[model samples]
Every structure is written in structure tokens, then in C-alpha cells.
Target chain A: AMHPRKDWYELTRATNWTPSYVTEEQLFPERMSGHMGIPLEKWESYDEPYKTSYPEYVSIQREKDAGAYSVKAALERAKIYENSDPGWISTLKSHYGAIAVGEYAAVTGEGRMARFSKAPGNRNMATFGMMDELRHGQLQLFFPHEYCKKDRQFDWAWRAYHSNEWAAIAAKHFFDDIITGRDAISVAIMLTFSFETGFANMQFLGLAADAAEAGDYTFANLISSIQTDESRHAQQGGPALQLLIENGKREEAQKKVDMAIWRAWRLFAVLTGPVMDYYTPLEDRSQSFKEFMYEWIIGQFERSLIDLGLDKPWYWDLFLKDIDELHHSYHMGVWYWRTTAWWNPAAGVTPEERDWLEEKYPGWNKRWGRCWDVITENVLNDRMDLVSPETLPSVCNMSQIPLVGVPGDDWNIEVFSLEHNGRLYHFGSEVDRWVFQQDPVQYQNHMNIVDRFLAGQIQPMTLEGALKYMGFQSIEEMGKDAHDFAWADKC
Target chain B: TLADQALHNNNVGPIIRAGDLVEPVIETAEIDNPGKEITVEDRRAYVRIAAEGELILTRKTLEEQLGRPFNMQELEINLASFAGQIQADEDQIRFYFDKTM
Candidate 1:
């Protein structure tokens, strides 16, 4: 019977090791740099005034860890339907696989996650996040792995993430963000406050609804299990951001918030925005992504952001207009992409059936009607190259950030075109295009790049380099999965 | 004044209980009974008048007023819980009627 304090103290001690010859500088050279021009020396100069040592740090941490684990153990003992059910477990498998990749990436790179094992109090919080990821990762895999061992319908669910290029890429992107990016603060913010507060949580609840509708209590239970844990992580962010703001560096806090919102919105766009808003099987689809965000995510996030002394996000106004502007066209983009990436391109020409896409998505045929028609025609004609490269839509590589500029600020993004350009190949756009064209081979190249960069593959220089140094494989992977899913085992 | 501040700190007041329904209001409505009338155990509905006042029955008639969204299920639940508390602990504390509408 170890005292709760003992566990915290021990873990703190584990992270609180000092170097003999190699100073903290040499060991964590990349992470030492500041976000703004503020030198690493300046940031490192200030130490914790409270000066929580190894023992005290561990005690409190261990207690929280123990309690969380106890809940986890209790959940496991209850045998809450992870393996027995296929439909719901399929979703959790994706969720957990996403977590493991996220954690593995963050830990390796010059990301903010590395900072967890440094400070005493901050370490405690990070430890909890680590625990959360661990629990979620296990729970996410358990059911799917179990089902794959049992049924064939869900056989695709297990290895699909590990094997398939798209699923692997999605999982890889999510994991890379959580582990590598200096997105720890953002992780606590958007993951907990923005997405978890309502948006993604609602999506999971929709999964629950899907399970119930499919007559699968096991799947519903699995979703509920993960969701219960996610809610707590969400709760932590509101207060955590406030505390961080109060501690010091108000401007940095604002920047973190902006960065976080941008990251969260992107992930949500891919995960919930697409899935809940678009891909949901007709019977399972209850509402559009935008509607879910407005109802669940925005209200809470807006209030929390305001409390953090930051105004509302920048990309909001555009998002509002896009409902009417890019609504149907957006779903068309989703449908087209899912089809292009998932469907066999060479032997194409499958008649689409998405009446709901027209119904729920506003301005279905008006704003983006032409865009939809063109893509549909291209896909139909097997001119997939036209859709991918020749006629690249602006929406294809659009800004993932909602509030583009500053908080309490709104602006229509001014259109700018390259009038005078010589071949127009400056940055990695050419390489990016080439990479995107590789089909399955693309995943291998992307993974190699991510592994190298996150594993301190490139020497830190530019802002992008600094961002990469922070362990972000791509913009797609940033500020996600900071908390553990609560009700994971129940499902 | 000292006692009031002390009460506030403890989340209890000399005048109010922690879970007390301080703002309960009595609202009335008239409806056409579509269902068959059930016999009441008692015909005499006691109307206790605590204060002395002059009453007048006017001939002019007015349409019935309706309450808002929470007039049905929620309001009844709230009313019943409060009333049950008052009845269960009459000797424990004063059932203060601050005002009525």
C-alpha cells in the first residue's frame, strides 16, 4: 500500500534527473529556444519560485495517477464490451491507434511533450496527460484488436490503421502532433477545451448513437467508456489555460491560444467535421459538422478563450459565411476526396448517392455547385490527375486555422495570385505535389520525413524548422490528444 | 451586521437555508377539463387568510394567462420537492413566506 504521495514523488524523481557532463542545454538543445525572439537563455533563467523538489512533486502526481489507474483497472475488470462488439470497437481502435502514434511521435522529437519530464509542477500535469494517452491508447486498441481476433467484418478495422496508407496517415498525423509539436499548451487548450468540451465529444456520442441504432450495446458502451475520460481532460483545459495566463507571459499565452485554435479546427475538420458532418452512414448521421461545432464546441471555447484574455478566433467569420458559401461544395470536396483516396482510381465510375449532402449542407448547388460538378466529372472520366494536380482547388490546401489573424478580429482573406512568376517553384510545393502523387508510396516517404524531422532529423533554423524541431511532421499533426478517454473500457 | 457576514461566509444565512426555494411563486391557470372528473376525498378546500383584507368579486371577465416553458413537468417537480421539505421539517426551521405574487 504505497501512499499516493509516494507514487507522485517517485515519478517526479524519475523525470527530475540532472546531467553530469552534458548540461540540460545540450540534452534538450532544440526545445530550449523561445517561440518569439525571446532567447532560450532568458526563458531558462527564470526557475519555479516554489521550487518543488523530487519528493513533493511525485507524491501529488502519483496519487492522481493511482486514482486514474484505479478507475482504469475497475473499468477493465468490468469487461466493458471492447472485444465483444465490432461496430463501436471499430471507432475506438481508430481512436487508440491515433493516441499511440501521437505519443510515440511527441516523445521522440524536440516537442513540448519533452518538457513534461523537466519541471516539477508542470511535469505532474504532463504525467497525467501521459497517463491519459496511455490509457486511451490501450483502450482504443483492446476492443478492435479483440474483434479482429474474432470477426471478419472488423478484421479490416485492426490492421487497416497499421497497413492502409490513408488510415495510417491519419493516425500518424494525430500522434505526431501530440508527441512532437511544442503543442503541449495547445494540447491542454483545444483538445480539452475546444474539441473535447463538445465538438469531438459530440462526435463520439454520435458513434454511441450509431452503435445503439445498429443494435450493438458493446459499441455504444465502448464509445461511452472513452468519452467519460475525455470529459475530464476537457474540464482541465479551461482552468489550465487560465492558470498559465496568470502565471506569466500573456502575449505568449495569446499566441498559444491562436496556435491551438488553428490546430484544433484542422483536426476537427478532418475527424469530426468530415465524419460527423459528411461520411456518417445516412442512418447514423444526425447533424452536420458545422451545426455540431456551433452547438457544442464554439460556445464553451469562446467563453474559455475570453477568460484566457484572448478574443474570439480569426477564421470564425469565414467559417460562418462558408456554411452558405462552401457548404455543399465542402461536402463535395469530402466526398470526392474520400472517393478518390479510397476508391480505385483506374477503374472508377461509381454512381454516388448522397441526398443528405444536399439537404443538410446549405448552398449545395450555388456556391460550390460548379466545383462539385467539375470534380464529379473528373472522377467519372478517370482524370484523377486533373483533380489532384492540373486543376488544384484552393480548398484543397486551404488554411486549417479558423480565426486567421488575431482574436476579436475578422477579415475576408484577400485573394492574391502570382502574376509574375518564373516556373513558380520556390518552396516544397513541387515536392509536396510529387509526394501526394505517390499513392501508397507517399505514406512511406511522409513517415521517413516525419521520423527524421521529429528525431532531430534537421538542424533547427527557420520558424518552420523550429516548428518541425518541435516535432510536427506536418501542419496536419499539431495540438491534439492531451487527455485520456474516461469511458474507454465501458465500450 | 456581523452575524450576516458570518452567515454569508458559511453559505448559510439567518433568513435562508442552503437549498431553500427563496423565489417560489404561486401561478394559476384555468383549463377546460376534457377528462372525466374524479371525486375528491374532501369537498372543503381550506383557504387560510393570514392577513386582514377587503375582497371584491368583479363581474368583468378576463381570459386566462399562461406561464412559460417550464410551467408543466419541471415546475411541479420543483414545487413538490420544496413543499415536501417544508412538511418534513416544520419543527426544524421557520417556513418563511417572504412575499407572494
Candidate 2:
């Protein structure tokens, strides 16, 4: 399930492939991959363009890297605002939190890279992705250093990617898609097009322009500097799709392509889908989730495929249908995780914010509104009893903890772990002896089963299977779990 | 500065192709404490050495790791040491020989 060394080195070598039959002069007769905007005609041209190759390219890259670190250094001067900018604070709390978790995913998701990076060409792609991540870390942390030094929020922000639960889980799942799956194509799709090119791409560019327009030159200057770096890095992912296809492991590549497109579509829907749809203060360019997907994301993938010399994957049709649906799905995951787990309370919607949701985005009752309606109803009616791990959707419900009688309330909240005795056992919190009082016998069986399973006592089951095994009475009832469970087990 | 760069066309044509450029041009400068340096700060002194081992690894500072390791090995060591160290280590050999492995 992990990226093998053979595949790894071979893939890296594939990037430098020179087809024996096709001469270089014919392939790229008049181009230079030079980033300095150096005149290629005046200089020399390579069929590969950067005749300079990756190593020399890196030297140039190191030179180009100066701007980002400069901006990062400048971030140090902006410390005063860190403690004061509540809006930015909230945003960073979310942004840095996500970046922090993604780093942990770097390790957790290593096994996932096996699928696509399995080829010699794809492995080289993975190496670039690794470099991309390192670049991301430098960029991610660069701006925050200034903001964090004063407020110390940035400091905590740095750790969130590493230590925080929600951050960890988000990183874990996201990495699960790549490292454990080793679906290099999906990594390209999600990280490159979906993430880098999706609706949220150039947020800093927009921010810089907006800051300048709003007369916040300090921030505008900072953001513009950072945007330059981002723009350069953005090219890496764009070429990623093309590179993955050219690597030529068709079936595996196709599956990854489909998975990547869908995954990116979902992430876009949640992250940028909301900002553009709901958060952008009802601007003139009132782009819907579908519109953004069409213009920025889906369109880019099509262009990427055309450039890569590959046809679009078969599942892309279903993907197109669900761009808008994905937005709701991602938001649901965010909301569910925030509401159920202690992972991301700070990013959770507040009462006043919830009220605004009803006003600004009308028809909250129709689709996602129904979800909010249900959650609000549950909260109001104290029907937290129904929101347990046992009774939720397969995709959205990440936590096993019930909604009601939570630890603070001790009302109707409950947790269930699968048992070897073919039964469900309930726990009130780890601290709550009420768990012992209510069902000690079943609880002991659960504890024993879980300990055995954890200690390599019983056969390891996929999370989906474990959840299915706990929640469903009939084996047939576990649908997605069977597939998703088997899928995760390979990782 | 760009105008100055534009004026001078360095190595106008390939005097040699990619392979030819691998050999360093000699007779450029005399060797005097090459790849060595001393840094003095606030009553403290530090010594640096010119070595190939430090350069390719990105371990030593720039001043301490001037020139290519292979070129330095050709100058300083016998084929046995060079072959022994590089042949035994795949990564070490690949680092200088191939752009990507």
C-alpha cells in the first residue's frame, strides 16, 4: 500500500524521459523552461525546455524562493495585528489548523502514495509532491511567524497541524486518500487542481488586490509578495495531472483520476464553496458552487487532460453532477465533526452565526437547511439521543460519540464500541462511572474486544467495518462499510 | 544590470555538449586555502575546511564546500577510495552521476 522504493526511483527517472525515436530538436525546438524569463532564443532551447533539468532548476528555484522567505520575514513585523484581527484570527485558526494537520498527514498518508506513485514516472511525481509539501510548509509558516509572535495564536496554529485532533483526523483522512492509497494521480488531482486550482486558488491574490483596494497597503504588500510564490508553486500541480497520465499506468491512473476529481470536487465544495457562496458579502460576481466548479476547477482538469494526452476518466460524469452536492457533503462533515467531536470547536458555527445562515443564504430549509434544521431541532428538542455513532450517515459522521447527554450534560449522550460477543456496548464518557452502572457486562466485553483488536488480539478490521460491525444488526445492512472498510484496510 | 547581461553572451555555442561541460576548466586561479574560511564574531572564532564530503551532503557551509566532489576526488584521492566510498553507497553514487534516479 505504500510507495515502494523501486517504483519511487523509477518514477523519478521517468520525468527525464527522452523518447528514443522522437528527437529533442523536434519535440521542444524553441523553448526554455527557465523561470527567470530568460530569452530562450538568445540562450539555448531544450526539447524538455528547462534543458537545465531538475537540479539546475532547483538552483533557480532557490533563487526564486527568496521572495517567499522575505515575505515570511516581513510577517514578523506584523505581530501587533495578530492579537487584534479577530476576523483574520478566526480565519488563521481555521487555515493554520488545516495546514498543521496536513503535515501530520505527510507521514500518516505515506502508505497511501503506493497506488499512483507505483510507476517510475509517478514516483518522480511523488518526489515533486514531497518538494511541493516542503514548499507549502515554508509558505504556510512564513506569513504566520509575524502574526504569531505577538498573539501566540500562530504558535498554537503551528502545532494544530501536528497535535490537534480535528486537524489530525482531517489530515489523516486526506492523507489516507494519497499515501495509504498511493494514488499519485489522486494526489495530483486533489492537491493540484482541486486544492491549488479550485475555487480557493489565488485567495492571496484576491486578498492582496482587495487589501490594496481597501487601503490596507501593509497587508496588500504582504499578500502580493506571498501570491508571487504561490503562483510559481501553482504550476507544479497543474502539470501534475498531465505528468500522472503520461506515466502510463492506465487502469490505476484512471481510478486515481476519478477519485482525485471527486475528492477535489468535494474539498472545493466545502472550503471555497462556502466562502464564495455564503461568505463573500453578496458581491456582484455571485458565482454559485457549480459555476465556480465549472469555471475554475472542472475546466482546468479538462484543459489539464488535453495537455496530458489522456481522455477524461469515466466517472467524471457523476462527478460533474455532484459538484454542488459535494459542497454540502463537505460542510456536513465539517459541521458534524465540529458538533460531535472536540476536534474543531473553534471553527464551529456560533448561535449568532447560525442565525445569519438563515438570513443571508435563503432556503436553508430546502437542502443543507434541512441538515441545519435537524441539528438545531436536535439541540432545541434535546433529541441528542438520536445523534449517536450508531445512527448516522456513513460518510459524514466521523465520530462515534452521541449528541445528547454529552459529557458536560451527561444527558442522553452515549458511545458504542464493537464487541466480540456480537453486541453493542455503551459508554458514558471514559470518566463516567455511569457507563459501569448502566451496562458493565457489555462494557467489559467491548473493552476486552477493543483491547484484543488493538493489541493484535483479533483480526484487524477496517474502520468502516468496525463501525458497521458496531452499528448494524444484520450483516447486509453494512453497505458502504464493506467497500470503504476493505478500501481502508489496504492502507 | 540586465543590459550588461544581455551584452555578454557567455558560452555562445556549446564548446562542448552536456558531457563535455562536466570537466572543470583549470588554470583559472591559484589554490590558496581554497574552500576554507575563518569567521570571527563578538570574541569568537570558527574554522572551516574545503572538502567534497561536506559539499554534496549540503552539510558544510558554502565557503567550506566549494567545487564539485568528483572533481575534488579526482584531484585529491586514488580511484580505490573514490570507488570504494561511492560504489558501496548507491545514493552517494547517484547524487553526482545522475540528475534523478
Candidate 3:
């Protein structure tokens, strides 16, 4: 079966050529290409270590789709969707809103890489990546649509990205920077390497394993199927980084990885941390969110960085600290600001759940649990209005999430700020301030909710006005507490 | 002092055994189930099949359960997370802790 061409590498990778009519700058515009002065001759040597021809790509992708669809069809008859724990359904709604449109945006990012990459092999690999993202976007959207008949919030799967939903704002803000704003090489590192390998892969595998334990085989099948494509295409980052390093752009490559990884962690903390730590039913949670981050993200992702001949992010210790602290605050914040979300936010702080939390994260009661104590007391005292949000907290200028920390800990709650080009920017952490400082043009113009509020964007400057601004059609479409405050009964 | 020595010698271990399985793959995956001392934590999305030192699942057993052709590669679709290093291919996937650790 061997062709006259020696292999796929030769046929596919051998497609690169020097420009005859136009200069390299004219051919690959430096601004959008992220070439970083890496010469074309260096780029021509680019090779995807995991090789696949067009036929193999289509064939394997076809099998993956077939497996996912068949599993979905079989599970529809099982009534797993109807009878599942409210927490598990919340997992679906949260994941669908956070990931579905982001995958669509990833399709555009990958398509850009396919068309604009200087390396022929990179362009070839990116073409497949584009297809993978399109499939992920469509299938994820379709899967949740079936559940729309069951709950109105599931309809937010398609609605979240375009809407001014806060969580969606944070999610899109991260993706828009990594996918839409970046040039090809930055997309390779940020989207494929830092995001795909580091965050989404870990999240999917965690969710898939949790789904299996929760007895939701359909979702387990869907995410795991999606992850197989992720495992293949995420390799695009490795070679791209290697090429960058070889071209004397090591610092440029490192900065991109550092910035992207931190940005990815911030968003995942808001999206996944609480879901893993709290929302998934108590018995089915094999690992706490902290443990999952430690095992799947911190250790594994750091190992990947070292393997790529890059240093651990300069903010390594900060990232490690936040693993324990960041998500806990967001979990509390989301529960209090539950209405802004698309899915019900579970308190997940029942007496039993708190015991699990304490066991997993020592000092849980004193550090993060102190804030929860006030909410728990309010709920048990029949003062529910005091427990939820009446006024907005300071939202981060970079990530657009709420600025959060423990109630009494000034150190953990401190804000970092920068004044750039006559606009004041506030970040939740020092690392966030660094992300904004790295490239102000990509991030500066975007206004967070607080920014908009102060600018008189809200008509009435009330809760009702803010809710309308957040794109909720009615109160019913907004998130409520998943358990309807039954977790408070444990108090 | 002996406990300290053992700790320094890296003898204490959770043994880091793990596996990933889709629903159908779960039917085919048969472990020796060495009973409750070796717990299989069902993590809703996948099963963490763990024992003391090593955990093993054979392709033959998986094929028998499925009543069709099967390979160990298919197990990855369901395996979201696992502990320890793994040696896997067409026939088997073995999850085990490092002896050095």
C-alpha cells in the first residue's frame, strides 16, 4: 500500500514553498500570523509528530460520531435524563452553556490556523482541528436541545454566548481572547496546548468519570468521545512550541503559554471548580475540585510544560495556592448570585457535604466556610433575602467575573489595578493584572458589568435593571438554587 | 523510627490503580474483584478500579461480555481519569503504581 511518496509526512509536510512574487511579510502578515520574526525556512521544517492522512482523519472521526450518537439513542430510552439527580442535570446545563459556543468559536480559530499557518503540516493538522471543533459545537448544542423539553434553562445552550449572561461573559471573554483575538501561533499554544491539553481535557475526563459514577452513560459517552479528538489535535501545540523554541522565540512562546494557562485556570475555576467540589451528588464525587486540579491539572500540566522544554509558569506557586482557594470563593459567589447563571447553583454545603469538603480541603470551615456559615444561618433563620445578592460585587476588568475572596481575609481579597490609556483596569489577582499588561490592545476596550454600571449603561440602576441587562427573558430562565434550599435543612 | 525509615524508603503507597470504561465497555471489563479490600469507586462518569499494587483487565473477558469484537483502545472513551502509569494496547490495559515510588 506504500505510495511512490515515502509517507504521509512527505506528501503533506512537503507542501510548503517560498513566495515568488510577494515578500514573506506580504505573504504572511506579521500582525495576524504571530510569526514573531520566525523565518519561513524554519517554519518549513514543521512536522506533526502524530501523523494522519485526510482519509484516516475522516474515518476515525466518523467512528467517534457513530459511537456518540448510538449511545445517545440508547440512553434516550433509559429515562436517565428525567430521573437523574438535579445536581447531575445542572452539570449538563453548566457544561453545555460554557463549552458549546466556545467550541464554535474554536472552529473559527482552527480554521484561521488552517488557512494562515506558514507551515504546511500545521495547516493540515489545523484543518482536522477545525472539523473537530465544528462537530463538538453542533453535537453539544443538539444533545442539550433534547433536554430543553424537560427544562427551559437547557435552551440557554444556544443562547448563552450571544447573551450578556455573566458566566457566559467570563467564558466568552476567555475564549474570545484565546481563539478569536489571537493569531495562528498564539492560537496553537493558547487554545490547543494550554487549553486543550491542560484544562478542557482534564475537565472532560473528570466530568466523564463523574457521569459514569452518576449513571449518566449518555453524557459520559458524549464527552469521552469528544476527548479522543482533543487528545489527537492537542498535539498541534507541541510541534508549534518546538518550532518557536528552535527559532529563538522562546520568551515569546513562554509568555503566551503563561498568559494562556492563567487565563484558562481563572475561567475553569468559575466554570468547573464548584461543579466538581459541590454540585455533583456527594456519593459520586470521588475527588474534590482541589484534588482534581492537583492531580489532573497542576501535576499533569506542569509535567507537560517541562516536557515541552519550557519552564513552569512564573506564577506557579500562585496557581497552586488558588487551586485550594479560588474555586471555593466562586462556589459561594455563584450560589449567592445564582440567578445570573443558566443552571441552578447548589449550595452543596449540607452537613455531610461540608464534612467531605473539610476532609478534602483542611481549614475549610475557617477559610472559605466562614462565608457559607452566614448564608447557612440566614437560610435556617428564614431570612433568605439577606443570603442572596442585592448589590453587585466588583467584577474583574480582565476575566469579567466577580472579584471574590473570604469575608475577613484582606490578603486573599486584595485587588491589583492598572491605569492604561486613560482607562482604569482592576484584576482579581496579580496574575490577571499581568495578563492584561502583556497585551492591552487585545483586552482593554471590553467593559465588565461594574464598568458598564458606573458608565450609566443600566437605565434604572436596580436589580431588575441589571437582570434585564444580563439578557434573561424572564425570572424563570434565570438560575435558582438547585436543591430549593433543602441543603439548609441539614443545618 | 522504623515508620520514618519506611516513609523515606517510599514503601507507603495508595498504589494508584485506575481504569476508564464506557457503559458497554464496563460490561466487558471483568476484574478478579479481590473483594472490598480492593474497592472500585464508581465516579458516575467512569469506574476507578483499584487494588493494592496492580489492577488488570483482559481483552478476552471484555470480548466475552460484549459478544462481539473488542479492543483495549475502546476503553479510553469511558476513562476520564486514572491514577498511576498504564501499559495498554489491543489486549489489555494495566494500571499500576511505580515501584520506585
- Candidate with top lDDT is 3
Q: Over the stretch A259-301, how does candidate 2's per-residue lDDT look in tens digits?
A: 4444444333444544344333332223454554575556764
TM-score-best of 1 and 2: 1
Candidate 2 chain A weakest ten by summed lDDT? A42-51
Docking class of 2: incorrect
Candidate number with the higher TM-score (2 or 3): 3
Off by over 4 Å in 2: A1-59, A72-87, A100-129, A145-156, A161-167, A180-249, A275-290, A306-321, A328-491, B1-101
**Ordered list by TM-score, greatest first:** 3, 1, 2
Report the lDDT tens digits of candidate 3 across residue range A141-188.
988987787788888899999888788889888898998888898898
In CAPRI terms, model 1 is classed as incorrect
Q: Write model 1 residue lDDT over A119-206, tens digit each, in one string.
A: 3344344454455455555545544554444334233333334433343444454434433443444455534554455445655675
Reference-based TM-score, model 2: 0.45
Q: Would you list the C-alpha lDDT of every candidate in the order shown?
A: 0.39, 0.38, 0.80
The digit string of per-residue lDDT tens for model 2 on B6-93 reads: 5532211001111111122111111222462312111111111112221122112212333334333232121111111222232222
Question: Candidate 2: deviation at residue A411, Å?
Answer: 28
Complex DockQ, candidate 1: 0.01
